[PDB]
């Protein structure tokens, strides 16, 4: 079971590349508000 | 609009038309054209301090006492431009090909 | 009076086992159980001397005990036991609560609560065992014990972090054994010990634990470095194993010193100059972490010597810990001056002292660059000297000798001259001037990826927190 | 900081100095 | 006992003496894999010797090697070069990993050889090399009683073979448990 | 080469008596009885024999096994030896019966060491015995590799180059690596005037490298490939070339204007 468990690792370390995309989201969306 | 009112507007009015020229668009203006733009380097690397100068001297403590906020981030945006652009031609310096090898 | 004593140290022992208990059974929170750990192993030291030893006893007795019943009898054995109370069943906490770890679910088998329990059983062991300095035979039972017993287990994300310590107390036990009296039952000990540390090694690559394999490959690179084998050590580096991200700094500082002295006698001193001062912005400036920052701050100066330059006087003189690297300034003026008899006698007092830290026998290295250091700095004065002048000034032996230690000079390009024989002087080849070719443009192309190194592991770890903001309510 | 504190030089005090004055009046 | 020195007198005679010699290479093959890396291409050399009878203890040495060296890839191969040594009933890390290190690149070739022909599963189109533990493996989770592992990487193996016989020996007719394993299929 | 009835016997009795060829045929034989007792490596349990049976006899029966192959120039051999003579003189603590026993064996490992020019490998192999400064440098002993090393306690080379003339322990055993010392120390003492200085003098290099003869100045230069002229040598070797291939490494003709282009382009992709 440890090839399904290997897999669950990019769940995780992806998941702090998602955390980056919220950084550009926020800087986006207060570029919506002023146009 | 149809296929030929797509392609031939973008070949006229976009943003700014440089066309007509496509290999000298940017051949012709960023290394033909220095004199009139990039002269004097050595005083065109003071305007890029002059920028910094003009924000980082006065705010540095991170609050509001010279009232400014985005000082650091006034300066960042215009002078990362002038580094980019330095850097283009810096590539297209090499890009001339004056067919030297040995 | 003794009743008091068992029930006040059992209560604080539980009240800190149900907050890491809580956390490790919803989803995953182990990040969380890290922190607290920290603290559990100065808690657990300043609290095993106080209420005496019985803290303990009555820990194994309230939960169930798969191992531990005669480990606690055979750990107050070579103490001369005093009993009181001392039968089993005596003090009873649980009375059937489900965060208890209730009993007729736990007696009837239906239920396994041992996981969490025997684990986190040996922590509290070998934290005993170091406080009590007990060696000899209750070493190598303990060893004995918890080996095959992680084996068994199937250690999941949270679990990795409970044994990830106690590996530094099976390492620790044995070399302090060995220290203290040498014998033929150490060196086979010490063969399982090497066997059982790559095993358990594997078991992390899979999982892919960042202390555990932080601690593992600290106390595996300290064994190659006793033993003294170039080919165990060379190829154990180049993987690459060790994560750079949720690592301690602590457990970094210690990596970066292990690689200055394993790159020192590789005669590559570029690579080995940088390890030895990133250990040292690493490591913290505390009182704790001053045992380390002797033994780095004296192997800096090593390296410099080394390299042919000389480090600054300074550094002997503002700090606070120059008693000590009194040896290492004798050092550096012998080899500036280039005296020959001068080196000779200040090897010969301090020679019984670099013994301890093994840093004596790289002295016979430096001996070399004493007058390697002379000659560069004859040569930067006069640029055109003769072959017999030189050997007025260090009082050398013959012309014929100095001519050949500028040999191994510029072989590598460190003085960067020519010696002509025909006119009869040494000129120097450096005519400066270099602003204009590409070879500063080299390292100056170095620099702007050092300031972007700083990026992916800056703006990536601004919402890195930032996610507990948005999940938890605010008022 | 390198070269400079307790190191020193250990010469031109007296003896190197005042020779000095002898080698004006040899020329 | 080190496997260095040993390697390098294989080009002497007497090869009676060079069998006792991999037998004391076989302790130390989970201890020092450093000075054996470099003497690994004469393991190789010896496998296609019709001469070199020890290839089947000469297998058990390259697998413990290669794949401590971070290659997965040669862990399988050198392992099944003997098709004796072998153990997968053994609980172990190594062969764990070497079980699922197959497996991957068995689901790879699986649809690549499908359209060659549909019965690569029952044929030798397929490498053996793939085949053997990715059959052995699944009669180890038969006897175990576990039908997770078994039906899960058959479906990802494309193997018919699995499904229809294994499911004759599972057989319950409480009567539930035929309905239940069929639906996770 | 046989001669008692029993293999250990005659391995010992033909090692003083010559014919070091025929003697390591009969090292194939020995070999077959040690690995069954394992007797060439200390167990890990204990099996009550430690000076008794043959193992004590082993540590004599590799050490003339191993001065005979060093004489023939046998590497793989040799390196057998000490790979089983590196638990020797490790385990049964620090005393067996004479410790160290002979000076003769261990010498050789650490001289041929040198023959390389290796520094690494040297001073970090010695931590088995973890003495570098008394087992080795205040070793009386075998000091024909500890001499080099005690001329660097006061720093004189030119002594320890000038041994391998001088030295009494060079003649018999270690004459084997003395000639490749000496070839070696004198080609990196020449080594200087090749890739940097350009034109050799004739008559000065007789008395630089210590020659009793004008011709052997000549004979240097053959061997180390030199064009000669009148009075002169000069050096056409500063361009190297050739190698094999080389792509985008030591300064490069078409690729070099490529990894130019490709460090301008790392900083623009980092900001886009």
């Known amino acids: 079971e440890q090839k399904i468990q290997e897999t669950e690792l990019k769940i995780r370390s992806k998941t702090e590349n998602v955390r980056r995309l919220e950084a550009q989201r926020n800087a986006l969306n207060d570029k919506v508000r002023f146009i | 609009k149809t296929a030929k009112e797509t392609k031939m507007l973008m070949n006229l009015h976009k943003e700014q038309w440089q066309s007509g020229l496509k290999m000298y668009d940017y051949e012709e203006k960023?290394?033909?054209?220095?004199?009139?733009?990039?002269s004097m380097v050595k005083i065109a690397e003071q305007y890029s301090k002059r920028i910094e100068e003009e924000k980082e001297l006065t705010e540095e403590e991170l609050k509001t006492r010279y009232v400014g906020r985005q000082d650091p981030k006034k300066h960042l945006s215009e002078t990362a431009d002038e580094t980019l652009e330095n850097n283009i031609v810096s590539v297209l310096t090499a890009g001339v090909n004056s067919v030297a090898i040995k | 009076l003794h009743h008091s004593e068992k029930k006040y140290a059992e209560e604080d022992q539980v009240q800190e086992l149900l907050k890491v208990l809580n956390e490790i059974s919803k989803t995953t929170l182990t990040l969380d159980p890290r922190y607290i750990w920290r603290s559990l192993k100065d808690?657990?030291?300043?609290?095993?001397?106080?209420?005496?030893?019985?803290?303990?006893?009555?820990?194994?007795?309230?939960?169930?005990y798969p191992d531990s019943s005669s480990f606690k009898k055979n750990l107050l054995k070579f103490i001369t036991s005093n009993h009181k109370s001392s039968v089993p069943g005596s003090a009873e906490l649980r009375n059937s609560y489900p965060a208890s770890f209730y009993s007729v679910n736990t007696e009837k088998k239906t239920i396994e609560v041992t996981a969490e329990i025997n684990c986190f059983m040996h922590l509290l062991v070998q934290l005993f065992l170091w406080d009590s300095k007990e060696l000899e035979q209750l070493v190598e039972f303990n060893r004995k014990v918890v080996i095959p017993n992680l084996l068994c287990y199937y250690n999941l994300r949270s679990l990795n972090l409970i044994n990830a310590k106690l590996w530094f107390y099976i390492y620790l036990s044995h070399e302090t054994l060995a220290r203290s009296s040498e014998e033929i039952n150490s060196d086979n000990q010490n063969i399982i010990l090497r066997s059982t540390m790559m095993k358990f090694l594997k078991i992390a690559s899979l999982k892919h634990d960042n202390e555990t394999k932080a601690m593992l490959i600290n106390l595996i690179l300290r064994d190659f470095l006793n033993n003294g084998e170039v080919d165990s050590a060379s190829d154990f580096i180049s993987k690459l194993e060790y994560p750079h991200t949720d690592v301690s700094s602590s457990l970094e500082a210690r990596y970066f010193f292990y690689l200055s002295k394993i790159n020192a006698i590789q005669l590559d001193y570029s690579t080995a100059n940088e390890y030895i001062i990133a250990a040292i912005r690493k490591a913290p400036h505390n009182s704790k972490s001053l045992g380390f920052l002797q033994q780095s701050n004296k192997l800096h100066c090593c390296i410099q010597l080394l390299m042919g330059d000389i480090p600054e006087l300074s550094f002997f003189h503002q700090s606070n810990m120059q008693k000590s690297l009194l040896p290492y300034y004798h050092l550096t003026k012998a080899v500036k001056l280039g005296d020959l008899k001068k080196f000779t006698s200040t090897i010969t007092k301090y020679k019984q002292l670099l013994l301890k830290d093994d840093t004596y026998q790289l002295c016979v290295r430096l001996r070399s660059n004493v007058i390697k250091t002379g000659i560069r700095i004859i040569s930067l004065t006069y640029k055109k000297i003769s072959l017999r002048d030189i050997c007025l000034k260090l009082n050398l032996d013959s012309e014929q000798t100095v001519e050949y230690m500028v040999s191994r000079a510029i072989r590598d390009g460190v003085i960067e001259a020519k010696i002509n024989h025909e006119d009869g002087f040494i000129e120097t080849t450096e005519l400066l001037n270099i602003y204009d070719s590409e070879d500063p443009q080299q390292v100056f192309d170095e620099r702007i990826?050092?300031?972007?190194?700083?990026?992916?592991?800056?703006?990536?770890?601004?919402?890195?927190?930032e996610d507990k903001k948005t999940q938890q309510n605010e008022k | 900081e390198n070269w400079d504190d307790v190191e020193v030089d250990d010469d031109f005090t007296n003896e190197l100095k005042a020779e000095l004055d002898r080698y004006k009046r040899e020329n | 006992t080190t496997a260095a020195p040993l390697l390098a007198?294989?080009?002497?005679?007497?090869?009676?003496?060079?069998?006792?010699?991999?037998?004391?290479?076989?302790?130390?093959?989970?201890?020092?894999?450093?000075?054996?890396?470099?003497?690994?291409?004469?393991?190789?050399?010896?496998?296609?010797?019709?001469?070199?009878?020890?290839?089947?203890?000469?297998?058990?040495?390259?697998?413990?090697?290669?794949?401590?060296?971070?290659?997965?890839?040669?862990a399988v191969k050198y392992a099944l070069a003997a098709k004796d040594r072998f153990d997968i009933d053994e609980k172990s890390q190594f062969v764990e990993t070497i079980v699922s290190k197959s497996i991957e690149m068995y689901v790879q070739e699986a649809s690549?050889?499908?359209?060659?022909?549909?019965?690569?599963?029952?044929?030798?189109?397929?490498?053996?090399?793939?085949?053997?533990?990715?059959?052995?493996?699944?009669?180890?989770?038969?006897?175990?009683?576990?039908?997770?592992?078994?039906?899960?990487?058959?479906?990802?193996?494309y193997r018919l073979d699995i499904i229809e016989s294994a499911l004759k020996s599972k057989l319950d007719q409480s009567t539930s448990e035929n309905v239940k394993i069929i639906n996770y299929l | 080469?046989?001669?008692?009835?029993?293999?250990?016997?005659?391995?010992?009795?033909?090692?003083?008596?010559?014919?070091?060829?025929?003697?390591?045929?009969?090292?194939?034989?020995?070999?077959?009885?040690?690995?069954?007792?394992?007797?060439?490596?200390?167990?890990?349990?204990?099996?009550?024999?430690?000076?008794?049976?043959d193992l004590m006899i082993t540590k004599r029966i590799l050490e003339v096994g191993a001065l005979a192959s060093i004489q023939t120039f046998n590497f793989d051999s040799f390196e057998n030896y000490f790979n089983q003579l590196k638990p020797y003189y490790f385990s049964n603590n620090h005393k067996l019966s004479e410790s160290d026993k002979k000076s003769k064996l261990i010498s050789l490992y650490l001289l041929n060491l040198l023959s390389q020019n290796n520094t690494t490998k040297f001073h970090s192999e010695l931590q088995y015995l973890d003495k570098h400064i008394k087992n080795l440098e205040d070793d009386s002993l075998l000091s024909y590799p500890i001499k080099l090393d005690r001329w660097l306690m006061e720093g004189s080379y030119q002594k320890a180059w000038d041994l391998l003339q001088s030295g009494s322990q060079n003649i018999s055993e270690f004459d084997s690596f003395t000639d490749i010392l000496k070839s070696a120390i004198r080609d990196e003492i020449a080594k200087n005037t090749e890739l940097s200085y350009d034109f050799l003098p004739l008559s000065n290099i007789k008395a630089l490298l210590f020659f009793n003869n004008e011709k052997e100045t000549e004979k240097f230069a053959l061997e180390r490939n030199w064009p000669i002229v009148n009075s002169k040598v000069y050096f056409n070797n500063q361009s190297k070339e050739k190698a094999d291939y080389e792509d985008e490494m030591m300064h490069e003709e078409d690729q070099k204007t490529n990894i130019i282009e490709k460090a301008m382009d790392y900083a623009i992709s980092i900001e886009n």
Not at chain 6, 35 to 48: C, G, M, R, V
């Open chain 2, 30 to 38: 960023e290394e033909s054209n220095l004199a009139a733009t990039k």
């Open chain 3, 449 to 465: 990826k050092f300031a972007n190194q700083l990026h992916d592991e800056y703006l990536v770890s601004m919402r890195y927190p």
């Open chain 6, 1 to 53: 080469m046989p001669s008692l009835a029993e293999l250990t016997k005659s391995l010992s009795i033909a090692f003083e008596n010559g014919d070091y060829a025929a003697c390591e045929k009969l090292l194939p034989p020995i070999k077959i009885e040690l690995i069954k007792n394992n007797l060439l490596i200390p167990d890990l349990s204990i099996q009550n024999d430690i000076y008794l049976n």
């Open chain 5, 9 to 74: 007198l294989l080009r002497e005679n007497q090869d009676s003496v060079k069998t006792y010699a991999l037998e004391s290479i076989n302790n130390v093959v989970d201890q020092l894999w450093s000075e054996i890396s470099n003497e690994l291409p004469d393991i190789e050399a010896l496998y296609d010797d019709d001469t070199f009878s020890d290839r089947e203890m000469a297998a058990l040495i390259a697998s413990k090697v290669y794949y401590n060296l971070g290659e997965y890839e040669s």
């Open chain 5, 112 to 157: 690549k050889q499908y359209t060659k022909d549909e019965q690569f599963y029952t044929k030798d189109i397929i490498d053996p090399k793939l085949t053997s533990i990715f059959e052995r493996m699944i009669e180890k989770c038969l006897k175990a009683s576990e039908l997770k592992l078994a039906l899960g990487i058959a479906l990802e193996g």
């Open chain 3, 43 to 64: 808690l657990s030291s300043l609290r095993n001397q106080e209420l005496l030893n019985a803290e303990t006893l009555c820990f194994t007795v309230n939960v169930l």
